[PDB]
């Protein structure tokens, strides 16, 4: 009469690793690493991203004319921008504190584009002359739509005094610019006054900008440059502009009406009319696993990222 003590076994081929032994075949294993993605960009819990296509963030916020698609943007779950967008600044120049702005952006889900200085309020100055071949719209010359390139009116440029008070409850993103001509002739031909400035003040901002008249390379066919500058105008604060030339005035600004979880994704991956709880620059993830290896930069509720190629937990015993 014969009784034995023994253990389970099966026809399984799933392998684990240990410190002493690799590929120890086991009875029961649990893979805990997500290795795959749907290869599309998707809605994040029902909210569509903003796909900037061929436009950069600057091109968007200044309103480069090739970016008309983005004149009015709905609320987004996250932002997607190419590595090298073709439409940025039609007119060459610098965008001051650009990265700090994108950082701000990344904590923002929606803007309302509001008008802060009316294009009809410039009686003593020309407000539509005012365009460049560097920024074309359908063959004809144009300019960034959110700002107004003021020009002299009949051989004179009186001192602009303009202010705007923030009567809203939300912060405002205000943008403006300075034109740097190539020589002093174009300086007089544009603004009459040879020596000029732009002062900009708020309760925390105190800036004076002076044009830099100099000879540079043509970029986009221009040797002149335009530098853009921004601030966050708080509720009940006012912004005051004073200039006697070279002023690229605001027309519109952006009201910050929704804040929360966002990011600016770098990707070329097509939007694919899907919906996900976790998104990566390479594609979306639908998994119950706690680890993945697709990309470090994700948004949503995601598995934790690792660089591993395989990651399996032995649950059963050594197979035979």
């Amino acid at each position: 009469d014969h009784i034995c003590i023994g253990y389970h076994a099966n026809n399984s081929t799933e392998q684990v690793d240990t410190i002493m032994e690799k590929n120890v075949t086991v009875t029961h294993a649990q893979d805990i690493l997500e290795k795959t993605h749907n290869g599309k960009l998707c809605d994040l819990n029902g909210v569509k991203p903003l796909i900037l296509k061929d436009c950069s963030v600057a091109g968007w916020l200044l309103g480069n004319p090739m970016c008309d698609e983005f004149i009015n943007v709905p609320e987004w779950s996250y932002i997607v921008e190419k590595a090298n967008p073709a439409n940025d600044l039609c007119y060459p120049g610098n965008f001051n504190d650009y990265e700090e702005l994108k950082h701000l952006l990344s904590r923002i889900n929606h803007f309302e584009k509001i008008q802060i200085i009316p294009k009809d309020s410039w009686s003593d100055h020309e407000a539509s002359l005012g365009v460049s071949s560097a920024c074309p719209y359908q063959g004809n010359s144009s300019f960034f739509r959110n700002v107004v390139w003021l020009i002299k009116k009949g051989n004179a440029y009186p001192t602009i005094k303009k202010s705007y008070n923030n009567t809203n409850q939300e912060d405002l993103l205000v943008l403006w610019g300075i034109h740097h001509p190539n020589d002093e002739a174009e300086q007089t031909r544009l603004y009459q006054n040879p020596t000029t400035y732009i002062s900009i003040g708020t309760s925390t901002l105190n800036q004076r900008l002076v044009p830099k008249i100099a000879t540079r390379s043509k970029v986009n066919g221009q040797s002149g440059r335009i530098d853009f500058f921004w601030t966050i105008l708080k509720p009940n604060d006012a912004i005051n502009f004073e200039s006697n030339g070279n002023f690229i005035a605001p027309e519109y600004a952006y009201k910050i009406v929704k804040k929360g979880d966002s990011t600016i994704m770098k990707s070329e991956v097509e939007y694919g009319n899907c919906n996900t709880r976790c998104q990566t620059p390479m594609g979306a993830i639908n998994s119950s696993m706690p680890f993945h290896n697709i990309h470090p930069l994700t948004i949503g509720e995601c598995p934790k990222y690792v660089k591993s190629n395989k990651l399996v937990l032995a649950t059963g015993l050594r197979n035979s």
Binding site: D1, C4, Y7, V24, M265, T315
Partner: protein
């Protein structure tokens, strides 16, 4: 193994045993076949299940990358940013792999320990009332019904009972 029993004194596993993890095999006039243990398998299920949750949970406070941009005159801080994010990515990749390597070894030795523990709850109740082949099998100095095996399973093997024909079998 580390406890000598799996892939040791008990050479292989029983395909016919799909009743559980660690079981017995009874072989008496009435019938052959297998039967698993419950207070042995289940206790191993909890321990392995709890361990898995523990590993995962211990891992959800891990570092999460964030994108930050920099201009061409911020090369030092951008490089600092890159090295500090890979730095943490490498730490957590190290931690997860290493906790998997180490628990795998323990999970395997846990099983082995639980089989050897089983072989010794039966043996230390059978005394000199049975043969010990040493292959993970036991032969009797007496007769055993199908529900007699159930005494040595349940843990309630009656010693002040079968001693007569055991001692006299010699």
């Amino acid at each position: 193994g580390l406890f000598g029993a799996i892939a040791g004194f008990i050479e292989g596993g029983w395909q016919g045993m799909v009743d559980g993890w660690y079981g017995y095999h009874h072989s008496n006039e009435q019938g052959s076949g297998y039967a698993a243990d419950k207070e042995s398998t289940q206790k191993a299920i909890d321990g392995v299940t709890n361990k898995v949750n523990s590993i995962i949970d211990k891992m959800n406070t891990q570092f999460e990358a964030v994108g930050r941009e920099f201009n061409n005159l911020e090369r030092r801080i951008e490089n600092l940013n890159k090295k500090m994010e890979d730095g943490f990515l490498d730490v957590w990749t190290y931690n997860a792999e290493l906790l998997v390597l180490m628990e795998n070894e323990r999970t395997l030795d846990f099983h082995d320990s639980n089989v050897k523990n089983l072989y010794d709850k039966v043996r230390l109740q059978l005394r000199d009332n049975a043969k010990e082949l040493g292959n993970g099998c036991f032969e009797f100095y007496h007769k055993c019904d199908n529900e007699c095996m159930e005494s040595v399973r349940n843990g309630t093997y009656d010693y002040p009972q079968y001693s007569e024909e055991a001692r006299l079998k010699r």
